Amino acid sequence: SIQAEEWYFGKITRRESERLLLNAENPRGTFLVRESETTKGAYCLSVSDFDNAKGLNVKHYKIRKLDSGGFYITSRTQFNSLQQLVAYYSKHADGLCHRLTTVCP
Numbered sequence: 001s002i003q004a005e006e007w008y009f010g011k012i013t014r015r016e017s018e019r020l021l022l023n024a025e026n027p028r029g030t031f032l033v034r035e036s037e038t039t040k041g042a043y044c045l046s047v048s049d050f051d052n053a054k055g056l057n058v059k060h061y062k063i064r065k066l067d068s069g070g071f072y073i074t075s076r077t078q079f080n081s082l083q084q085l086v087a088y089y090s091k092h093a094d095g096l097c098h099r100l101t102t103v104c105p
Contacts (some may be wrong), residue, residue: 007103009034019047029101049097059097
């Protein structure tokens, strides 16, 4: 289950995810998965980033789940579970601001 996952924060708002991710101790790629605020059945992958320009900041990526079974951010790259999606993005930055690194405290 998705609920079993420590990086799954469930029903928390976008603002709350930012409050948690904007901690100065967080390195790039600190992340969490939560429900989308407004898209029924969809999730959001919230990720911390850092650059000298913007400093510490947060990006949010919508994760879709098909009834047909797949989880994905881009339809071209789907996974059989949210867990597999997270494992993939921990190795590939692809189009994300950074590869996933550590679960948000």
